[PDB]
């Protein structure tokens, strides 16, 4: 699933089944097994991908399409072929969110007067997906969804066969990427506060080098999710972080101001948001981890 | 466009009872063939269902086992046989194929089958 | 096995107004609803197939509206002769009907 494009691939057998009365015959075999050369040469349906983007057929080492003829004029014709459809998600919950990726087909240039579509087995039993055959490495196939209905066009009315595909990230690489590193340059900040107050430039650094490291992290997590318009949950997260890490150093700039006029009121500061802090962080990666997890 | 069952059925318990729907104005080959059952005064309850084409069968799972749904394709018929009914399935059988959406356009006469001693 | 719940089991209405039925599926059933008609000592008649789709023959005072669990079936100027029972059954997967619902005139 390309998240950065909004789109996923499939690689699929599409199989398509009706009656043609006029390949009606009367020999030996009851099923002729033909070739992929045949079925050009015959009506098939002309299915095509309401959201396919650009599919191929595959023709290697031939054409991988399949024609058979039941003795009785019913026809079987499959094809394998990789669809890359498209899939709006919506990345408001980002990187712990779920979507539906649909798969819409139905008949170019038959209305449903001519041409109607219908699942060949239990409308749950159509779309099989294998048991090996996830090429997913960020989500987690879990289950699948179909559906049957009727669009209205400037043509005319088309029947159209949808099939969601539900899909949930796995949060397990972005931990590492993004909610572990940026814990850890809070962490990295709120130690700064067990430092003497006569060690100003240390201080200094500590603070201003996990800024830096806010920062990068918030351009380096924001540059693998697509440039959308809003904010997702991790952008809450780091700028959250990076609120506790500025407020951090804000504290610090707070009692070397406040040193050398009136040290009480630095050396209370200093133990009061020595304390505060992970008290504060602690409650905010509850509260977070909890209404984005029950989500 | 019609499926007409047998007739009524007075058999006893313990024994096999077969019912028949045979079908007129189309090829059973095409569609997927149903077997209901209804008791009085209640809702109905899908037995099973076979893909004539293949020979291919699904069953219910409070009658896995005990029923049986085969098909005579050169006469367009279908076959339901009960192995060992009890004393409380005597309802009302039908049999039906599917539709458009997958539904049960087209259904039978029904057939009542009934255990006594 | 995706239980259907048809409400209610029993209701009485008179002549001439509307009558809304429910049925609720426990599982997802996307269009596969369908509406099924039983006169007393008869064979079901199919009304409505998929989720809101007249068959050919049933007059256009039923409507039918569908969703991903909740289903309704709608009469509109209810005549005398639609003293039936009422099911409604999914065919998403292997098809399971309602209990159904009778309805009668006052």
């Known amino acids: 699933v390309s998240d950065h494009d909004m789109e996923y691939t499939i690689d699929v057998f599409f199989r398509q089944s009706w009656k043609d009365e006029r390949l009606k015959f009367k020999g030996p075999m009851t099923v002729l097994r033909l070739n992929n050369l045949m079925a050009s040469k015959i009506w098939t349906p002309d299915t095509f991908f309401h959201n396919g983007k650009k599919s191929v057929a595959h023709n290697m080492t031939m054409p991988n399409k399949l024609l058979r003829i039941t003795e009785d004029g019913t026809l079987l014709y499959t094809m394998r072929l990789t669809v890359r459809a498209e899939c709006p998600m919506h990345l408001e919950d980002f990187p712990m969110d779920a979507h539906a990726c649909p798969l819409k087909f139905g008949s170019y240039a038959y209305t449903r007067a001519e041409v109607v579509y219908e699942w060949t087995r239990e409308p749950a039993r159509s779309v099989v997906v294998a048991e090996d055959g996830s090429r997913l490495n960020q989500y987690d196939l879990l289950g699948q969804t179909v559906d049957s209905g009727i669009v209205q066009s400037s043509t005319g009315e088309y029947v159209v066969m949808t099939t969601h595909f539900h899909l949930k990230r796995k949060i397990g690489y972005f931990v590492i990427q993004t909610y572990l590193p940026c814990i850890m340059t809070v962490i990295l900040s709120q130690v700064s506060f067990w430092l003497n107050r006569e060690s100003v430039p240390a201080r200094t650094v500590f603070g201003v080098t996990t800024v830096l490291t806010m920062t990068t992290l918030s351009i380096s997590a924001r540059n693998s999710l697509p440039k959308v318009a809003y904010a997702t949950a991790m952008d809450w997260f780091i700028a959250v972080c990076y609120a506790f890490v500025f407020s951090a150093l804000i504290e610090f700039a707070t009692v070397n101001y406040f040193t050398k006029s009136q040290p009480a009121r630095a050396a209370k500061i200093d133990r009061l948001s020595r304390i505060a802090f992970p008290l504060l962080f602690g409650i905010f990666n509850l509260v977070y981890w909890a209404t984005y997890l029950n989500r | 466009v019609q499926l007409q069952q047998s007739g009524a059925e007075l058999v006893k318990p313990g024994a096999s009872v077969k019912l028949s729907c045979t079908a007129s104005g189309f090829n059973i080959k095409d569609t997927y063939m149903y077997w209901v059952k209804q008791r009085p005064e209640q809702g109905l309850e899908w037995i099973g269902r076979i893909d004539p084409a293949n020979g291919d069968t699904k069953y219910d799972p409070k009658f896995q086992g005990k029923a049986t749904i085969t098909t005579d394709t050169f006469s367009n018929t279908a076959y339901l046989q009960l192995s060992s009914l009890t004393s409380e399935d005597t309802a009302v059988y039908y049999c039906?194929?599917?539709?458009?959406?997958?539904?049960?356009?087209?259904w039978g006469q029904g057939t009542s089958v009934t255990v006594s001693t | 096995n995706i239980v259907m719940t048809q409400s209610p089991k029993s209701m009485s209405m008179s002549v001439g107004e509307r009558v809304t039925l429910s049925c609720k599926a426990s599982?997802?059933?996307?269009?596969?609803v369908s509406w099924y008609q039983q006169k007393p000592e008869q064979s079901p008649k199919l009304l409505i197939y998929?989720?809101?789709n007249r068959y050919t023959g049933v007059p256009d005072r039923f409507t039918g509206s569908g969703s991903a669990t909740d289903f309704t079936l709608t009469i509109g100027s209810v005549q005398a002769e639609d003293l039936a029972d009422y099911h409604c059954?999914?065919?998403?997967?292997?098809?399971?009907f309602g209990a159904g619902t009778k309805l009668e005139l006052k």
């Open positions: 059954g999914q065919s998403y997967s292997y098809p399971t």
């Open positions: 039906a194929r599917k539709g458009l959406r997958w539904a049960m356009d087209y």
């Open positions: 998929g989720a809101s």
């Open positions: 599982e997802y059933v996307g269009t596969y």
